[PDB]
Amino acid sequence: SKEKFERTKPHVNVGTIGHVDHGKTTLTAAITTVLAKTYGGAARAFNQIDNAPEEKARGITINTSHVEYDTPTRHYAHVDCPGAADYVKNMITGAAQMDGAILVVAATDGPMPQTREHILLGRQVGVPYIIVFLNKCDMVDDEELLELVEMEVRELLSQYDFPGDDTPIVRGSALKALEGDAEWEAKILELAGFLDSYIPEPERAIDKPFLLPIEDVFSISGRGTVVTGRVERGIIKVGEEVEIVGIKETQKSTCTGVEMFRKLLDEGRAGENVGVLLRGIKREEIERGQVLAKPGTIKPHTKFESEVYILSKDEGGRHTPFFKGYRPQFYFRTTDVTGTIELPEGVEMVMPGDNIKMVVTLIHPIAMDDGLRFAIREGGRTVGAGVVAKVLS
RNA sequence: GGUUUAGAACGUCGUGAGACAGUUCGGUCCCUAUCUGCCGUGGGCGCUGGAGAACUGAGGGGGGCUGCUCCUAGUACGAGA
Ligand SMILES: Nc1nc2c(ncn2[C@@H]2O[C@H](COP(=O)(O)OP(=O)(O)OP(=O)(O)O)[C@@H](O)[C@H]2O)c(=O)[nH]1
Ligand SMILES: [Mg+2]
Ligand SMILES: [Mg+2]
Ligand SMILES: [Mg+2]
Ligand SMILES: [Mg+2]
Ligand SMILES: [Mg+2]
Ligand SMILES: [Mg+2]
Ligand SMILES: [Mg+2]
Ligand SMILES: [Mg+2]
C-alpha cells in the first residue's frame, strides 16, 4: 500500500481452469516470469503464488491465489482456483469473477473427469469465453500422438455449448518456459496474443447502483478488516456510506480505502477486483457470503419465487423425482446456502429435465433482485440453474 | 535376589510341642587341573646324500547385517487422496 494505481488500459478478469496435478500454478508462474522480462512488468515467482503448510506438505492448491500482470494493450488480473474435488465451493468464487478463462488440458493424459465438471460449472455461473492450453507436450516426443488430444478437447466444448473448433488451442510446456528457453518462452508470449485477440473488452456496468459480493475476508494488522471481491456494478468512492447486507443481519459502515493488489484507488469502478477497508468492524461478525451495497437499494430476503430449470442425465443433473422437503445447495453470487423447496398447487412431483417455478425457503437471509441467477448443486455434482421471478420475504 | 537348615514375628490351624508352594526381616557358595577337549606356543624325529630360500595349493578357518536420503519421478498406478 503506497503507489497509486493509475487507470490506464482496460481491466480484464482472467482465471485458469483444470484437473488436479494437470498444470495450473506452473502455467500462471510461467506467465508471471515471461511477461515480466520482455514487456517489462513486475517479476514475482512460483513460490509466492501457492504457500503455507497446507499447500506444501501435499503440494496442491486449496485457496484462490491471485496475480496481477500487464501487457501492452490490456491489464490482467489472474486467479488460480484449487481444481480438486473437495474444494469446489471456493473454486466457484474465483470462477464467478472470471470473464475469459484459460482451460488446461495435458497432452500426456488428455481429458479427465473434473475437466468436464469445471466447464459444466462455468456456463451456469458466467464464463462467456474460454482458451485451452496443452500443458505438457515435451513429455511425448511424437507429432501424431499429441494432435489426437487436440481433437478430444474440441469435442468437450462443442458437446457442452461452445464454439469448439474456433477456440485457440495453444501448446507448450510451463516448466521449460519458467526457467528460460527461447523457443518455449516465445510460445507463451503467443498465448498472451490470443488473450488480446480472442477475448473481447468486457462491457462493464457504470451507471446502476453500487454492489460488491465478498469472495474472502482479510484482517490487516493496523488498519482493520478488509473485504475482497469484484465490483459487480456501479462505482465506489473513498468516503461514501456502505450498508452491509447478507447473512446474519444488516450493518452500516463507511469505505475507508479501496485498493487493487496493494496499490491505492479513489474510484474503484465495476469489473475490477478490489479490496475495500471498512470502518470499525471486526473479523468475526463479517462473514464470507455477505454483500456491500449502497444504503436503501437492496434488501435481505429468505423466500423467493424462481423459474428453475432442472437438468437431466443428458446435460448433467438428476435422474429421479423429488417431493417437497428436498434441501440442496444454492450458489447465488459467491457462497452456498441450503433451502427447502415448496412446489405450486396442481404439481405432484418434479421430473428431471423440466421447466417449472418454485418457492424456495432459505435457512439464512441473502440479498437478491428480480433478474439474478444461480446454480444448484448437491452430492458432489450439479442439479440445475435458474432465474429469480419475484421477491416474497 | 528366589526356593529348602538353625533366629524372630504376623495371620491361621493345634490343649500343646510345633505346623502352613501363606506372608515377613536375617542368614559361611570349597578345590593349585592328571586325562579328554579347547586357544596359543615350542622341542623331537620324519619327509631317504646334506643345507638355505621362495612358492604351489589338497584341506581348514574368518567374513556375509542393514537403515535413512536423493536421482529416475510426483513418472507408471489412481476420479482424487
Ligand atoms: N514436465 C512438465 N511437467 C509439468 C508441466 N506442467 C505441470 N507440470 C507438473 O505438474 C506440477 C504442477 O501441478 P499443478 O497443476 O500446479 O497442481 P494443482 O495446483 O493442484 O493443479 P489444479 O488442481 O489445476 O489447481 C509440477 O510439479 C510439474 O512437475 C509441463 O508442462 N511439463
Ligand atoms: Mg494451482
Ligand atoms: Mg500430488
Ligand atoms: Mg537375603
Ligand atoms: Mg528370607
Ligand atoms: Mg546384612
Ligand atoms: Mg567358586
Ligand atoms: Mg571357505
Ligand atoms: Mg542391504
State whether the beta carbon of A138 lies below 7 angstroms from any atom of strand B: no
Task: State CA A176 to chain mean position distance.
Answer: 28
At residue A173, what are phi and psi to the nearest 5 degrees?
Answer: -80, 150
State whether the beta carbon of A42 lies below 7 angstroms from any atom of strand B: no
Angle A320-A324-A328 from CA coordinates, rounded to 5°: 70
What's the Cα-to-Cα distance from A282 to each of A235, A237, A286, rounded to whole Å? 24, 22, 7
Best of A33, A65, A175 for a ligand 1 pocket test (most atoms within 8 Å of beta carbon): A175
**Does A22 sit in the ligand 1 pocket, CB within 6 Å?**
yes
Instruction: Considering all nucleic acid strands, name the nucleotide whose C1' atom is nearest to the C-alpha of residue A83.
Output: B80
Which positions of chain B lie under 7 Å from any protein Cβ?
Answer: 74-76, 78-81
Distance A167 CA to B35 C1' (A): 105
Q: Which residues, in sequence order, are CB contacts of A141 under 8 Å at separation 6+?
A: none
Contact A359, A330 (CB under 8 A): no
Q: What radius of gyration, in Å, describes the C-alpha atoms of chain A?
A: 22
d(CA A293, CA A241): 9
> Within 10 Å of residue A343's Cβ, how many Cβ atoms?
17
d(CA A3, CA A263): 5
Question: What is the amino acid identity at position A121?
Answer: L
Helix, strand, coil percentages, rounded to 5, for chain A: 20, 30, 50
Looking at all shown ligands, the one closest to residue A65's CA atom is 2
Contact A308, A384 (CB under 8 A): yes
Distance A90 CA to B29 C1' (A): 83
> Within 10 Å of residue A216's Cβ, how many Cβ atoms?
17
User: Which three cell numbers mark A18?
Assistant: 483444470
d(CA A321, CA A319): 7
**Does A174 sit in the ligand 1 pocket, CB within 6 Å?**
yes
d(CA A153, CA A149): 7
d(CA A368, CA A373): 9
Distance A114 CA to B39 C1' (A): 77
Q: Is A83 helix (H, G, I), strand (E, B) or coil?
A: coil
d(CA A167, CA A191): 12
Q: Which residues, in sequence order, are CB contacts of A191 under 8 Å at separation 6+?
A: A31, A102, A131, A133, A170, A172
Resolution (A): 3.4
